[PDB]
N, C-alpha and C. Protein backbone atom coordinates (compact mmCIF):
# COMPACT_ATOMS: atom_id res chain seq x y z
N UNK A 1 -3.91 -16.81 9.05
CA UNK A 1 -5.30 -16.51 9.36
C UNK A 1 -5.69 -15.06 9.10
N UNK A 2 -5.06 -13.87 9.68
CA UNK A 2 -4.96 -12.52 9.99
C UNK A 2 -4.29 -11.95 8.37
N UNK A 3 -4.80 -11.19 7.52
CA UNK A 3 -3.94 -10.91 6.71
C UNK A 3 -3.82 -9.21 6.82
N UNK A 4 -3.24 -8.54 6.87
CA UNK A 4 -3.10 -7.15 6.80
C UNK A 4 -2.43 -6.15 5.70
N UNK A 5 -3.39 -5.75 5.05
CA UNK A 5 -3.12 -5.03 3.83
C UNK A 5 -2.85 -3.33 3.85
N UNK A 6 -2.17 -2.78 4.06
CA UNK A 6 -1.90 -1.40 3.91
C UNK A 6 -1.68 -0.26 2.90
N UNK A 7 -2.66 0.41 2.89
CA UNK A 7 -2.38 1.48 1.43
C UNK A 7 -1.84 2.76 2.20
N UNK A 8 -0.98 3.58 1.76
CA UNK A 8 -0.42 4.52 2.23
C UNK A 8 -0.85 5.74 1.50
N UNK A 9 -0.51 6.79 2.61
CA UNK A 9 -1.23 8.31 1.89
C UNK A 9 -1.35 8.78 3.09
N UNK A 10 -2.04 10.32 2.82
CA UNK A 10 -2.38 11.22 3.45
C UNK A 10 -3.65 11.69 3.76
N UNK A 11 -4.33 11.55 4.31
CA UNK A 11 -5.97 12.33 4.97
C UNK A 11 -6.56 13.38 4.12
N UNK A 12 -7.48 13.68 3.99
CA UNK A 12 -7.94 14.99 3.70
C UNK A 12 -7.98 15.39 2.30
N UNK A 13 -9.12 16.38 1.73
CA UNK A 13 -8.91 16.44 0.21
C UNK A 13 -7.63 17.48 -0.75
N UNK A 14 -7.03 18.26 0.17
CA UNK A 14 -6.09 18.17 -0.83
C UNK A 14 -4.63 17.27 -0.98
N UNK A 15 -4.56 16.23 -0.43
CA UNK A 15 -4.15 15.40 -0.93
C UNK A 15 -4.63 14.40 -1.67
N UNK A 16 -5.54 14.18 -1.84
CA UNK A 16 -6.44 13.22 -2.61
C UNK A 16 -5.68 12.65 -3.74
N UNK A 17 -5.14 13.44 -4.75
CA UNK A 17 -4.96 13.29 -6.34
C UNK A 17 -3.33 13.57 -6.01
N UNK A 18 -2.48 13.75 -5.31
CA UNK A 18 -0.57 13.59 -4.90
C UNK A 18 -0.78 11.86 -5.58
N UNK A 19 0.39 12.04 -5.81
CA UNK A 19 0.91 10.81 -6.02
C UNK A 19 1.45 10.35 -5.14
N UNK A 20 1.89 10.58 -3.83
CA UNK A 20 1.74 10.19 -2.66
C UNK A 20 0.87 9.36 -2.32
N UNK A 21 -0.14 9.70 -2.92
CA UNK A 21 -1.64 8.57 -2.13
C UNK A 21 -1.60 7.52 -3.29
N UNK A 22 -0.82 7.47 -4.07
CA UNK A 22 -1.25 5.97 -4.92
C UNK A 22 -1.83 4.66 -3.96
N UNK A 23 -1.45 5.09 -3.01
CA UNK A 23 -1.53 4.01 -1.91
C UNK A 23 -2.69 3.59 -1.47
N UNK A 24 -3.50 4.60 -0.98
CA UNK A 24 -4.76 5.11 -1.06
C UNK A 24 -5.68 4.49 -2.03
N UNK A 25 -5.32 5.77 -3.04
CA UNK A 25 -6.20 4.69 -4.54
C UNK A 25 -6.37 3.13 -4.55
N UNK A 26 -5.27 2.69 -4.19
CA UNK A 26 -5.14 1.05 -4.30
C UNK A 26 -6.21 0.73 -3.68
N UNK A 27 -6.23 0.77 -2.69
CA UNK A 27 -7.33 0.42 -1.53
C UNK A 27 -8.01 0.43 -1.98
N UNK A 28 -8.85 1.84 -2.55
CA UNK A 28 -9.89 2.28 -2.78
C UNK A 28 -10.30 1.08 -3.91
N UNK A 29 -9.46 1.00 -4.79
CA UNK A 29 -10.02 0.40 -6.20
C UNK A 29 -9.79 -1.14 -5.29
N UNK A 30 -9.52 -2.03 -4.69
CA UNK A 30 -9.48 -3.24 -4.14
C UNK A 30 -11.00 -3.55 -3.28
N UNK A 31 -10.87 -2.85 -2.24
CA UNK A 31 -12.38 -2.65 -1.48
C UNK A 31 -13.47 -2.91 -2.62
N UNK A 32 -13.52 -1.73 -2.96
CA UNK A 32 -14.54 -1.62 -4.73
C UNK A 32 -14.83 -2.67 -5.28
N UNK A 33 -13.84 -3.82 -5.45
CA UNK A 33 -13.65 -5.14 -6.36
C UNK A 33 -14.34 -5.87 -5.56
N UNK A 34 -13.54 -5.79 -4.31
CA UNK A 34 -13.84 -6.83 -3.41
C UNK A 34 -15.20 -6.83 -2.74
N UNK A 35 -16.10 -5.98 -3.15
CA UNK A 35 -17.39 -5.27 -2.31
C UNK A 35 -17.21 -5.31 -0.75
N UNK A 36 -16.25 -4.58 -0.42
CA UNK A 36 -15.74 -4.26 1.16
C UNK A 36 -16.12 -2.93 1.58
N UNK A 37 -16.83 -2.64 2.26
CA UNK A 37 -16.61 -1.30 3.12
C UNK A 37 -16.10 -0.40 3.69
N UNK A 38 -15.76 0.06 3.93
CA UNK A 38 -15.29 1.36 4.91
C UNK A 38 -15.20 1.49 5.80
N UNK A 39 -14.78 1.95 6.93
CA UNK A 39 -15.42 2.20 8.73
C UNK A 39 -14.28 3.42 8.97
N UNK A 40 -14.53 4.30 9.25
CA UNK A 40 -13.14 5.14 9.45
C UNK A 40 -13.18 4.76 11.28
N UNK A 41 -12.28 4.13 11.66
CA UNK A 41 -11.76 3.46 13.09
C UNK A 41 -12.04 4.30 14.21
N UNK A 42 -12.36 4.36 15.63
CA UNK A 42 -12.64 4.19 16.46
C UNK A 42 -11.09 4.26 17.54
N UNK A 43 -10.86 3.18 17.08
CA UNK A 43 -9.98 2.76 17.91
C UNK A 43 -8.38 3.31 17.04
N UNK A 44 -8.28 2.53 16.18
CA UNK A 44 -6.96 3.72 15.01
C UNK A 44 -7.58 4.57 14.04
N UNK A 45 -6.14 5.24 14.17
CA UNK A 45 -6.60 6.18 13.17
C UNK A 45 -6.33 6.26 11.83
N UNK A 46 -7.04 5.23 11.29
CA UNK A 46 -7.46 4.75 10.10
C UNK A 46 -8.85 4.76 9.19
N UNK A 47 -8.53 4.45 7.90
CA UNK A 47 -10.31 3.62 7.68
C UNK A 47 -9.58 2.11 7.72
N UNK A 48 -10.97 1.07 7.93
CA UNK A 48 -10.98 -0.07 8.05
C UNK A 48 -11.68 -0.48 7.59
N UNK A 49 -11.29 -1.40 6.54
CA UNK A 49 -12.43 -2.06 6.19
C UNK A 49 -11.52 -3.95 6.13
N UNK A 50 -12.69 -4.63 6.23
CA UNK A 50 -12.33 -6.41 6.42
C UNK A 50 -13.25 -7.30 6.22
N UNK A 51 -13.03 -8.20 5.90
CA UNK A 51 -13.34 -9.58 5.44
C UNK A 51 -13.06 -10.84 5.25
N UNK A 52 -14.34 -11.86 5.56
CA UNK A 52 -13.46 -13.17 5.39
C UNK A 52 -13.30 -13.74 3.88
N UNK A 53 -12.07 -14.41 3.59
CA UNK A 53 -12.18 -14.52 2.08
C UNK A 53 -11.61 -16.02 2.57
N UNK A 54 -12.52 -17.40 2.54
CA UNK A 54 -12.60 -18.76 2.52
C UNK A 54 -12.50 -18.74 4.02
N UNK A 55 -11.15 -19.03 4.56
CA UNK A 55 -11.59 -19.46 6.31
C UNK A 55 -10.33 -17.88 7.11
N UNK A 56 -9.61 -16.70 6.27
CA UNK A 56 -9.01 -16.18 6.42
C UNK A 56 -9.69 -14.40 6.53
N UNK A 57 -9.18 -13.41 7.61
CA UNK A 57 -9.65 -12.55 7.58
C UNK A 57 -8.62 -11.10 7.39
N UNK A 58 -9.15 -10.67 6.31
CA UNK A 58 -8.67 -9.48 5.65
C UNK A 58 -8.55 -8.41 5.83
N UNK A 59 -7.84 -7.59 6.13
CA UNK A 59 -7.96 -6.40 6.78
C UNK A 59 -7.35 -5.27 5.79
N UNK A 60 -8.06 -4.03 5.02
CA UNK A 60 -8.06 -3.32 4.20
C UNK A 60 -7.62 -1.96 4.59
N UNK A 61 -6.39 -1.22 5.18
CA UNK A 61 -5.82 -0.45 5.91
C UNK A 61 -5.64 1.03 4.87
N UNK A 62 -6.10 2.41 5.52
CA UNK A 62 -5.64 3.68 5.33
C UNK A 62 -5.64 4.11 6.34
N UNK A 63 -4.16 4.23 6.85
CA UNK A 63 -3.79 5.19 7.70
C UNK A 63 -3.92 6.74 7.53
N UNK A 64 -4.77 6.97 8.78
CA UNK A 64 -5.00 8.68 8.60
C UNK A 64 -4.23 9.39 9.59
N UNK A 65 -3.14 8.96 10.21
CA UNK A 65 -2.21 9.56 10.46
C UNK A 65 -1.58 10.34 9.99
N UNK A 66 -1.56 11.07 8.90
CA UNK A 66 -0.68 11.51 8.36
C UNK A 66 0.47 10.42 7.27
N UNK A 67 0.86 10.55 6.36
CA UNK A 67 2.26 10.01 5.68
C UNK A 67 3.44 9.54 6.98
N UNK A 68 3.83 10.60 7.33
CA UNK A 68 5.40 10.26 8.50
C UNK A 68 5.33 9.53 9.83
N UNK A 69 3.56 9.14 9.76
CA UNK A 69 3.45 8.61 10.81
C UNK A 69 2.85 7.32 10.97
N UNK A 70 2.94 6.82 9.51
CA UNK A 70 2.26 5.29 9.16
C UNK A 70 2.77 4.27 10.05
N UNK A 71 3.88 4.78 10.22
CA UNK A 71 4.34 3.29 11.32
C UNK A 71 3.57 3.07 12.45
N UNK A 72 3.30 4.14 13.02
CA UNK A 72 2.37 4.04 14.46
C UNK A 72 0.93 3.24 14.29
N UNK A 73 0.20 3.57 12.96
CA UNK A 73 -1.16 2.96 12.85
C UNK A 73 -0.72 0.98 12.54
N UNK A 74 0.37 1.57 11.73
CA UNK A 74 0.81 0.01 11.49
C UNK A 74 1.30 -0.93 12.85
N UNK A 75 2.15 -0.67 13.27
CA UNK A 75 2.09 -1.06 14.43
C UNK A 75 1.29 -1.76 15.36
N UNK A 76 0.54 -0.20 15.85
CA UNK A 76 -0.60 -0.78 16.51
C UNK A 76 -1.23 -1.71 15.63
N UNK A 77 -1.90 -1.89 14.73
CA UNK A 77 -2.60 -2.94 14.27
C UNK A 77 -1.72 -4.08 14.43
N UNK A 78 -0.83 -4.14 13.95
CA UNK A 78 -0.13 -5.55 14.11
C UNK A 78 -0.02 -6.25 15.65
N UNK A 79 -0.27 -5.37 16.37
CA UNK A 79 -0.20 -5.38 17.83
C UNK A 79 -1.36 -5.80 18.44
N UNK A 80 -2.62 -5.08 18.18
CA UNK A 80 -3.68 -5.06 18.52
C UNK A 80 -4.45 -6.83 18.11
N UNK A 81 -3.91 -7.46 17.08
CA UNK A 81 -4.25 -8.24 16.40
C UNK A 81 -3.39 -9.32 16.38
N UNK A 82 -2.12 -9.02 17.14
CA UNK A 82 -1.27 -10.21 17.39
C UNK A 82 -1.03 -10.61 15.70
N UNK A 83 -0.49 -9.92 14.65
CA UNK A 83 -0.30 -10.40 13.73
C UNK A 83 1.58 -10.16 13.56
N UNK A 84 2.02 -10.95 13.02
CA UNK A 84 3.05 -11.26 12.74
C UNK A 84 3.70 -10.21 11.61
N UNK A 85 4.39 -9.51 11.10
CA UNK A 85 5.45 -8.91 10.05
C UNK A 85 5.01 -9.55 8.69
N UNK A 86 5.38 -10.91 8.83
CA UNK A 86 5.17 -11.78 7.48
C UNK A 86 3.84 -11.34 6.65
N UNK A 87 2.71 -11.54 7.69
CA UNK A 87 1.73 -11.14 7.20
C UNK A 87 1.20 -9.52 6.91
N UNK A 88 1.69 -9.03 6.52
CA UNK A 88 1.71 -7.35 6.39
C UNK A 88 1.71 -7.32 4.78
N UNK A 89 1.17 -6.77 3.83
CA UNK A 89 1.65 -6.19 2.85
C UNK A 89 1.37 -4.48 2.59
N UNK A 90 2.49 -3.58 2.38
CA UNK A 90 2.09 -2.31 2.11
C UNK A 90 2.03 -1.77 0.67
N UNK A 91 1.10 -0.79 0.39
CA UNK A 91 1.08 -0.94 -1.01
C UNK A 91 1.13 0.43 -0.90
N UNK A 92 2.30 1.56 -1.74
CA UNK A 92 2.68 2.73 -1.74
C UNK A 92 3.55 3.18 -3.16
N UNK A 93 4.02 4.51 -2.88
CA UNK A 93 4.16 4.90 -4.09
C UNK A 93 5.94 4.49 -4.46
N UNK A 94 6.65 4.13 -5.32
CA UNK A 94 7.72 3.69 -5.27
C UNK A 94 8.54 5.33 -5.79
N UNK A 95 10.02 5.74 -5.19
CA UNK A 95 10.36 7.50 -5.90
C UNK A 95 11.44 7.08 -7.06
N UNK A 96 11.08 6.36 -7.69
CA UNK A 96 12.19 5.92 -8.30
C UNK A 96 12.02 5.15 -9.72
N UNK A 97 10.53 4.85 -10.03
CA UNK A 97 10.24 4.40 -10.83
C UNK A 97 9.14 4.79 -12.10
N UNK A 98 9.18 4.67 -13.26
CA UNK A 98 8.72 5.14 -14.39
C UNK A 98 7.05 5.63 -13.80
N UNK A 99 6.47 6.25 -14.07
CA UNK A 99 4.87 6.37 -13.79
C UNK A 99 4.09 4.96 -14.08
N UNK A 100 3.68 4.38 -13.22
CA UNK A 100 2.36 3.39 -13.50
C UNK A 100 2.75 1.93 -13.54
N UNK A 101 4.68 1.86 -13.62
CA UNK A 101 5.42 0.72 -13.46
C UNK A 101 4.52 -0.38 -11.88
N UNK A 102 4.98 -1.09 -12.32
CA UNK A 102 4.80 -2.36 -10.93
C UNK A 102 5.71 -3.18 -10.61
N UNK A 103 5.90 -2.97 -9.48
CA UNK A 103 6.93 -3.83 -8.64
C UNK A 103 6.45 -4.64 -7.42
N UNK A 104 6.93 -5.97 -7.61
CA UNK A 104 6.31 -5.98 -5.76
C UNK A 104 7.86 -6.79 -5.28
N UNK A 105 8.41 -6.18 -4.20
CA UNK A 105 9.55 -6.27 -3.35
C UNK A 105 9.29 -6.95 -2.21
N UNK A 106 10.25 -7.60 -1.46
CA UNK A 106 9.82 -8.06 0.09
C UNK A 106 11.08 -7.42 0.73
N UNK A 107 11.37 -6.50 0.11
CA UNK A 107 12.63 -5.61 1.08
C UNK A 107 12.98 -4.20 0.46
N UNK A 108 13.84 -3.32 1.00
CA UNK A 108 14.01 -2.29 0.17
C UNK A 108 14.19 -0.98 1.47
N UNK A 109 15.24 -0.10 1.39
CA UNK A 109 15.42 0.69 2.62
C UNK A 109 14.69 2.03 1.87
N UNK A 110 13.84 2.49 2.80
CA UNK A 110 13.36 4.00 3.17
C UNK A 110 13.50 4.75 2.14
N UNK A 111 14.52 4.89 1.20
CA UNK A 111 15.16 5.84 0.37
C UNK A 111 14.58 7.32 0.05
N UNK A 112 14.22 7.57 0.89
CA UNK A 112 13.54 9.01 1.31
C UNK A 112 12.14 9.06 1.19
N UNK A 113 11.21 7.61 1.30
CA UNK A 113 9.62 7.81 1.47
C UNK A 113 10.05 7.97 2.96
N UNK A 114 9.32 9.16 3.38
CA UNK A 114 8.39 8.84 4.85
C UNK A 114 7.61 8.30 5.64
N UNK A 115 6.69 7.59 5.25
CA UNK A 115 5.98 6.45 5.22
C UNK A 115 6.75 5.65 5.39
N UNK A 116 7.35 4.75 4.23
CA UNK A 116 8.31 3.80 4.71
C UNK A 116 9.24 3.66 5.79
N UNK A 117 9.78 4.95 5.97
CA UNK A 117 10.48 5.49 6.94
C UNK A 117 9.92 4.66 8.25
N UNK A 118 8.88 5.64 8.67
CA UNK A 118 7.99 5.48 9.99
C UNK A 118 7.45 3.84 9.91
N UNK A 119 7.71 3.42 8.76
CA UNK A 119 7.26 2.25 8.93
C UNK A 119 8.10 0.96 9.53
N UNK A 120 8.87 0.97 8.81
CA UNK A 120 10.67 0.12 9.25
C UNK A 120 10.96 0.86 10.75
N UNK A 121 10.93 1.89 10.98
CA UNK A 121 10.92 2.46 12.73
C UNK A 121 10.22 1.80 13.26
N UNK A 122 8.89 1.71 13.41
CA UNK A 122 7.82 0.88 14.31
C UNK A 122 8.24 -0.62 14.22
N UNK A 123 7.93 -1.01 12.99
CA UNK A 123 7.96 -2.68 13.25
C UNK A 123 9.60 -3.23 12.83
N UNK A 124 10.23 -2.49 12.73
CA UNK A 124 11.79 -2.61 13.40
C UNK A 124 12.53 -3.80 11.99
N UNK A 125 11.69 -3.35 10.93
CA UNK A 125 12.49 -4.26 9.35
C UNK A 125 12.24 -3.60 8.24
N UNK A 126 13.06 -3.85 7.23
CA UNK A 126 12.56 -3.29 6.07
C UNK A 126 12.12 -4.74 5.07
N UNK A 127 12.25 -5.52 5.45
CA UNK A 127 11.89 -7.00 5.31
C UNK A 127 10.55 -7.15 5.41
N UNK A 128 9.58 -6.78 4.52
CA UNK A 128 8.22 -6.58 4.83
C UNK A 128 7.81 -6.89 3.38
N UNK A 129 6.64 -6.53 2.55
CA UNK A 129 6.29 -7.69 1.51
C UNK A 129 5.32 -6.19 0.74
N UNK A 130 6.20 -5.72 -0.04
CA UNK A 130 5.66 -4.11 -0.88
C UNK A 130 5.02 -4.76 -2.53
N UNK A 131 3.71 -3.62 -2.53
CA UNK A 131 3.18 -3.74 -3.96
C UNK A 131 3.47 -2.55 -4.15
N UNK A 132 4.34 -1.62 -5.14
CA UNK A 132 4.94 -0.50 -5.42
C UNK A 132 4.51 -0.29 -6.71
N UNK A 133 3.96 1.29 -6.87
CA UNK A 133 3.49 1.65 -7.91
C UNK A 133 4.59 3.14 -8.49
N UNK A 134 4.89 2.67 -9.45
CA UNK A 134 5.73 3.51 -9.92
C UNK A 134 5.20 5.56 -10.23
N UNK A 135 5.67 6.47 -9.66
CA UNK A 135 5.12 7.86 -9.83
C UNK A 135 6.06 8.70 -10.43
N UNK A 136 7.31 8.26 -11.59
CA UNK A 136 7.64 9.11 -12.30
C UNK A 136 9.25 9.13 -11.58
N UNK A 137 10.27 9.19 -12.29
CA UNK A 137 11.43 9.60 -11.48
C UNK A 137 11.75 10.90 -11.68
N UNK A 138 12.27 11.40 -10.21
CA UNK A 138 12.29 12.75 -9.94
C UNK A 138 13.59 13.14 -11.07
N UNK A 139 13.66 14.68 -11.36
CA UNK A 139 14.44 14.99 -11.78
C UNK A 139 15.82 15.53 -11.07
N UNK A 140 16.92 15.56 -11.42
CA UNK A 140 18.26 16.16 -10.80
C UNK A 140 18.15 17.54 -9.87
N UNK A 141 17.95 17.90 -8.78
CA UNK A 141 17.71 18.91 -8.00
C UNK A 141 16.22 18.54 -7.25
N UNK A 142 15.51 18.17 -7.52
CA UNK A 142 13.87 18.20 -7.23
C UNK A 142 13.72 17.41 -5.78
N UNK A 143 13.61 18.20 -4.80
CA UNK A 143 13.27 17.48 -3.40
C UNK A 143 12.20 16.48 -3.86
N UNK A 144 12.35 15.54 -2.61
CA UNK A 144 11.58 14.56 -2.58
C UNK A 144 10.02 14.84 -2.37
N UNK A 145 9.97 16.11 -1.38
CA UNK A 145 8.13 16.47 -1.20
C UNK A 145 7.66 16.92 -2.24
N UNK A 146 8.28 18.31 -3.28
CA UNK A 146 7.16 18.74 -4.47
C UNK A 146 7.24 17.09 -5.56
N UNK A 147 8.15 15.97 -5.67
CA UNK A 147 8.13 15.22 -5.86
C UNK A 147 6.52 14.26 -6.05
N UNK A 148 6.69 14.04 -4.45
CA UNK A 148 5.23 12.83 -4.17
C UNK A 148 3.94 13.75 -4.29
N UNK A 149 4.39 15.25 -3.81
CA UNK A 149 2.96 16.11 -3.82
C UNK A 149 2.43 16.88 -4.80
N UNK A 150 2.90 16.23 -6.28
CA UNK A 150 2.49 16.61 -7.09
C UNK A 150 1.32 15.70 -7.75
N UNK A 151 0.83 16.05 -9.04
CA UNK A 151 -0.74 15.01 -9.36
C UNK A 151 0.16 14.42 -10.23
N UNK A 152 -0.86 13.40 -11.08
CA UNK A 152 -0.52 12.95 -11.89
C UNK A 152 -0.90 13.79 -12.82
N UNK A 153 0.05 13.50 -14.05
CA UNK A 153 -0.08 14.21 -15.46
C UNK A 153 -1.37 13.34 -16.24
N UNK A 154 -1.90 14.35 -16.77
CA UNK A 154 -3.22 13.98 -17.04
C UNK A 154 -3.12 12.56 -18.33
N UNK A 155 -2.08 12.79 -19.17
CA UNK A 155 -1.66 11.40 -19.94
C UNK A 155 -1.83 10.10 -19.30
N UNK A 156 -1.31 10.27 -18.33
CA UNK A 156 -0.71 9.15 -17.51
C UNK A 156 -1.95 8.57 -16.38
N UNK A 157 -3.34 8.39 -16.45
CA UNK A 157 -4.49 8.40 -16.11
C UNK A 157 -4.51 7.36 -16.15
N UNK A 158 -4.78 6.74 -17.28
CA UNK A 158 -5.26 5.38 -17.83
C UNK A 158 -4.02 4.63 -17.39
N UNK A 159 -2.58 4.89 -17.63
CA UNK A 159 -2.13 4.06 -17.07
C UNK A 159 -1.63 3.87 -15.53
N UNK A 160 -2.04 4.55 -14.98
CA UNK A 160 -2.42 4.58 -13.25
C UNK A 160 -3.41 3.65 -12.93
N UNK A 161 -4.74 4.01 -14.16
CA UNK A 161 -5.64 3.22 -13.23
C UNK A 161 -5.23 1.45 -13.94
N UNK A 162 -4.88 1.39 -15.13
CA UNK A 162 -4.51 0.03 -15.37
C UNK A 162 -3.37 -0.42 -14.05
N UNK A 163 -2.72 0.00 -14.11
CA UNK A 163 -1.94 -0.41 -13.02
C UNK A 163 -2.88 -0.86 -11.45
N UNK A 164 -3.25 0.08 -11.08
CA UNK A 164 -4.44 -0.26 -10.23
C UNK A 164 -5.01 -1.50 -10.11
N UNK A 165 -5.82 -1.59 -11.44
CA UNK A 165 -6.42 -2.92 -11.72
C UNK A 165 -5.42 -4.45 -11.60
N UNK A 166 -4.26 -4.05 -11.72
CA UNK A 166 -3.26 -5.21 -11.97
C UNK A 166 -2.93 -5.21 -10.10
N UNK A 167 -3.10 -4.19 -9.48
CA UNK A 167 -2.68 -4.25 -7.96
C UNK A 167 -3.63 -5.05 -7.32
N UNK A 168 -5.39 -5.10 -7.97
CA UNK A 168 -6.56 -5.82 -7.61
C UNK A 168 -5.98 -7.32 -7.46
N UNK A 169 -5.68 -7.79 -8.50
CA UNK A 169 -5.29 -9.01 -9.05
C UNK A 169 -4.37 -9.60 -8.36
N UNK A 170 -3.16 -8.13 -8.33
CA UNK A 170 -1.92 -9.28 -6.93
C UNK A 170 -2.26 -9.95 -5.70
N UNK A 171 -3.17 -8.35 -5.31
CA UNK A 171 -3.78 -9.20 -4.05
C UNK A 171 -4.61 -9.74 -4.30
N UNK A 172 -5.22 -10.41 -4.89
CA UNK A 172 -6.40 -11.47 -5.08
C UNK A 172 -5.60 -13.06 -5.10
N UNK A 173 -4.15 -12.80 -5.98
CA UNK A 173 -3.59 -13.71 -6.19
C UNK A 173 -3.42 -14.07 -4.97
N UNK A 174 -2.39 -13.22 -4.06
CA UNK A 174 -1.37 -13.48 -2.69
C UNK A 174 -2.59 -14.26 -2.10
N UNK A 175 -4.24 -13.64 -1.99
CA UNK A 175 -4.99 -14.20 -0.91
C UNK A 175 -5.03 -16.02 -1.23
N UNK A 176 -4.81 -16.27 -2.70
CA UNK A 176 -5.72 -17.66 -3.01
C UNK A 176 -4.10 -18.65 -2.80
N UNK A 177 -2.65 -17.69 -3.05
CA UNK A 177 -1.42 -18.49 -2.66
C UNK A 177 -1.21 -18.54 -1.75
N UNK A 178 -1.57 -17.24 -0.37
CA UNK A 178 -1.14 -17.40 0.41
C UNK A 178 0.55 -17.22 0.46
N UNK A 179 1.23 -16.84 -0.83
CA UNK A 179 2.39 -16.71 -0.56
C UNK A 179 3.30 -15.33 -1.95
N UNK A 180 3.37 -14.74 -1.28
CA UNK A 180 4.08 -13.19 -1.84
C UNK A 180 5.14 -13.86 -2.93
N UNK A 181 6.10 -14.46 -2.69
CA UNK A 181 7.38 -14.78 -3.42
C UNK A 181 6.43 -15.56 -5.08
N UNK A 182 5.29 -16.26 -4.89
CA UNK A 182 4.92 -16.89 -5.73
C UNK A 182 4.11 -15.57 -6.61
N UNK A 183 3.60 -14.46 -6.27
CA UNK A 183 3.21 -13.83 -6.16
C UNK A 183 3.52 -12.43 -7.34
N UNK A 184 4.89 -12.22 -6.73
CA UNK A 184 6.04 -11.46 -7.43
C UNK A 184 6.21 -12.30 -8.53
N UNK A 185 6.97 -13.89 -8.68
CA UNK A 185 6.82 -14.06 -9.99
C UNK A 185 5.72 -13.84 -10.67
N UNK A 186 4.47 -14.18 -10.42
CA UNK A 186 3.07 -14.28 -11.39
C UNK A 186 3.31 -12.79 -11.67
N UNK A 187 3.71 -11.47 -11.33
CA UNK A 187 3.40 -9.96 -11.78
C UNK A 187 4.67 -9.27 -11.77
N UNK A 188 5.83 -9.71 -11.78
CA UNK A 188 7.40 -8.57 -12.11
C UNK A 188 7.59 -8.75 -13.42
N UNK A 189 7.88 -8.00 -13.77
CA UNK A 189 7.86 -7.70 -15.07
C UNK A 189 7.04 -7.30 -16.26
């Protein structure tokens, strides 16, 4: 019934354009498609935006917590809403993969996102249902923060936002299957 969609990132404009917020973007360009709104929350500290799509209601998540503290907004929502794990999908930046690549996973440990981190802490799995957008693999020495908190290279634009567009589509798919695993086949690879 409850579906809960999560884009990950950071608040505020100079993070805006990190590749950190791919997460973010997603949203942004999904809402957009979907002609959904905004509400920056009240109650979390998020924006919110939702909708019914046939007899099911959608919930369009940016946590403004901060990055290290996504688990807490996640959480609570899942809490607040009595929604189940299963139904969760987070959509964030993957540290490990080519720029603009797509993956969607239903598992995968922390491997130094923070976000993810705080996320598997709160709702206590890493067994959760990821649309992962690839931001370049780091090089040999390069911490993980100048990593995510860098922009994108201006080449690599078009295929960010194509990718984007293909993130519209997964979730459009997942909403009409209702099921992630069917999901991942229709878009890996």
């Amino acid at each position: 019934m409850v579906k809960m969609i999560v884009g990950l990132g950071n608040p505020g404009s100079k993070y805006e354009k990190t590749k950190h917020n791919i997460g973010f973007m997603a949203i942004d360009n999904i809402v957009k498609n979907l002609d959904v709104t905004f509400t920056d929350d009240k109650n979390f500290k998020a924006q919110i935006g939702s909708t019914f799509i046939n007899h099911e209601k959608v919930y369009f998540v940016k946590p403004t917590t901060f990055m290290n503290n996504s688990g807490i907004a996640v959480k609570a929502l899942l809490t607040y809403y009595n929604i189940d794990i299963t139904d969760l999908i987070v959509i964030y930046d993957d540290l490990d993969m080519e720029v603009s690549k797509l993956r969607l996973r239903s598992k995968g440990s922390a491997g130094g996102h923070n976000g993810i981190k705080s996320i598997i802490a709160h709702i206590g799995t890493q067994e959760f249902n990821r649309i992962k957008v690839g931001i370049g693999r780091p090089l040999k020495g390069m911490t993980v923060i100048n990593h995510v908190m860098g922009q994108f290279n201006t080449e690599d634009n078009i295929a960010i936002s194509l990718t984007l567009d293909r993130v519209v589509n997964a979730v459009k798919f997942y909403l009409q299957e209702n099921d992630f695993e069917k999901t991942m086949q229709k878009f890996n690879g």
